[model samples]
Target chain A: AAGTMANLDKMLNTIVTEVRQFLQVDRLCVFKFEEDYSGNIIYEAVDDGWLSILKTHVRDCYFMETRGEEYLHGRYQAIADIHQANLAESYRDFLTQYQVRAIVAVPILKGKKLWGLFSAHQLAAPRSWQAWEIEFLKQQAVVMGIAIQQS
Target chain B: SAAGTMANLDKMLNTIVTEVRQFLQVDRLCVFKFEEDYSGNIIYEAVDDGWLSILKTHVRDCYFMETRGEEYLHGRYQAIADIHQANLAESYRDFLTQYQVRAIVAVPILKGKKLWGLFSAHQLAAPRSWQAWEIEFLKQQAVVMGIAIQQS
Candidate 1:
């Protein structure tokens, strides 16, 4: 359901590009939510293989906390700098393994349901994120969620 | 919200039956609830007054669970073009005729891979062929209902 929707490819790709340029981030990845607390990176626009998390499985057990509840409350997770963020060490390992420093994870919800997560990652350095950037991606994720439900 | 934890799911279920009935343009759409007591009830239904009401009903041999169960592989749904057709068996057709149902499509709502209940559509009068897109939409609706079954 991620990259499989061929019609959404160009549009999702462009959104990724727009976010990457807007935030000047290294990569923007869209994760398609799976049945359980899991999902796979279905689409991505990144600087290199190091930044490419496409097709990778994000198997965090706390996905229920990280995105599930947030989406249920119509909220999103925008971690400006994960190193200082209060999070489980294992999840930090997850980010470190991905070479991710700064990240903004937005929930792609459909009809009051949590569908998936849309993330933007800054791989090079720990950066302070701005409100506008968070709002921008949040709106983009909303648009994508609408497109998903409509499709 | 599964079965026990239906905190705020009544609204969602109501929305589902209403939209599903409208989307299919069928005579009736019902979200049948199966209780632990073995007695089933139409917890929700969307029907035009002109059509016969299957809003509240019961069980049979070639019944609910036999149609779809999490334990049974290759058995999640049953769609019949006409209830009186040869494939349905004479006894089953007789049972449906008693309810005045001529055509039917049913998909089970699975809770943790176990049989929960069923999302059913019926034509009260003339028999009709269920379309691919219609079945696909019903399947998708089942998934949405499944999520509500698993969550609150």
Candidate 2:
């Protein structure tokens, strides 16, 4: 129900913060897609030293246009070291500019359509994202999907 | 995750009470929980402005428990359109009057197979005929409350 949009927002905020704490990551965010396929960081939880990144507009049309299909098909990206990963230069620069060393991004689906990405970022050093951590993020993405669907 | 469980449950309950009250357009909505002895208390509530608050108020009605509590355990509900016309016991009538409740619909909230509490909606200004759809909607809300309880 649209009337419960406030409740959904609060729940999403709780989900990101709790997931960030559980994963012990430097930052976590919920990036929601717009009609034009551009997205923005709508919700975020960052460690003390990291900058707050909420409302950061992400207009990476080239990056998303190429990889967005994989996400829609339930594929997640877990980069252990963004500097070493074989990503496009533009994407690599994007992460480095934000001081991100490693990251994991999971797709949040509203029913069958891709609604957003739930991402965890490590800022201080390159770290291997654990299997369990990625699995937990996938489950949380499913939960987020349901919450957003209800609203 | 373990430590945050209770807090998550509290938030969900607050959401439920707030939204349910708004959805029903009722003056008040609350969750009434029962103790082992059938004594109950309003644990969570959403009341309109100027209404008397009942949250945390404890009451023991042994007579009602002895007579009607068992029915509630099996998911029976009470849809009283008017306290005066329902021919309720004097104590029950007085209790409703004190809260300015002219109409009420209460559904049982269950935790697993056990009777957990009551999800109640009250009309304060005047009597209201609780419709079938309204009662069904409250039933679904009660089930959602039960799921949230078990999750937390």
Candidate 3:
């Protein structure tokens, strides 16, 4: 049991570290979807100030909306600089209030179904998505899917 | 000289599949190097299935290059969720049908502006999703596979 639990913990830690380093973002979070279509931020790697803000606002509004219809498709990305992004008005306000800027969300697909979303958020300034970066994010989502299956 | 190159090519291809399977945890993998003429013949394969049988049944019948010739020639990795919808030629379809393959992911291995071979994976019973990590891992191996081909 200890071995199994340790393996799981190691996998989670690696996932967090990989995401943080790969995207060069301020914070990274992974949410696991429940059977009822609801989900929770099961693992988070963030700086102290951001972590506090995340714990407070993440569950109440972000997770709820993310679990809603907006993220149902395969993958989605949002930026505060873009005027036409479908980000929730309140969500944008919250990001602006906290000085957060850009976000990218990729859905983890398992057997043609949406398993969960791997989201990366930036705090300092608006980030742009490059083709290769998006490709890397897409690949990261796949790794997350397999890691979830392993767990 | 081509025969010597072919021998070295075969060894390198086997090494690529062996490393990929171990690292990615997959059931099976295969690499098919083609000639310049697009005959779809197997110059090299990793799995133990008879080359003649694979070519006669799968390579001959499946039209992989017919529809996607341009993309493959352009050296892009094409991933297909379902083989039938992939628009491959009839021969490839027959081979896939016989093998009971549901999903296919193929990357065209290139060497200095030339299309050398294809690195591919097939899932038998249930369709397996190709994850980004696994693809990245495969792409890395593909690069190595190209180097091995060159050396051989």
Candidate closest to the true structure, highest DockQ:
2
Docking class of 2: incorrect
Question: Compared to the true structure, candidate 2 yields what TM-score?
Answer: 0.53
Would you list the clashing residue pairs of candidate 2?
none
Q: Per-prediction TM-score of chain B?
A: 0.81, 0.92, 0.70
Clashing pairs in 1: none
> What overall lDDT goes with each candidate model?
0.70, 0.80, 0.59
**Tens-place lDDT digits, model 1, residues B1-152:** 25544634666577657755754568889887777643467778888758767676766444544543443224657788887674776776776787778889987776656666778888886788987667766765665466556544
DockQ of each: 0.04, 0.06, 0.02
Candidate 3 Cα misplacement greater than 4 A, ranges: A36-38, A47-73, A80-86, A93-99, A110-113, B1-152
Q: A1-151 in candidate 1: lDDT tens per residue?
A: 5544554565556556545644557888888878776889988878755657789987777774455765676576777688889988988899899888888887887778788888888887777877756765676675566556645
Question: What TM-score number comes out for model 3?
Answer: 0.45
Better of 1 and 3 by DockQ: 1
Candidate number with the higher TM-score (2 or 3):
2
Scanning candidate 1 chain B in windows of ten residues, the lowest lDDT window is B64-73
Give the per-residue lDDT of model 3 (tens digit) for B1-152.
77866664555465446544434444446666664455465543343333222432225313444443456665467666677567876765776677667777777776645667677776665567777756655665565455545444
What would the per-residue lDDT of candidate 2 be over residues A27-120, giving only the tens digit for each residue? 9999998876789999999988677789999888663675366677668899999878999898898888788899999999887888889999
Candidate 3 clashing pairs, residues 3+ apart or interchain: A139-B132, A142-B132, B61-B90, B61-B91, B61-B92, B62-B91, B62-B92, B63-B89, B63-B92
| Best candidate, TM-score | 2
The sequence of per-residue lDDT tens digits that candidate 2 reaches over residues B27-102 is 9998998888778999999999679889998978765468547787765789998887887888878888888999
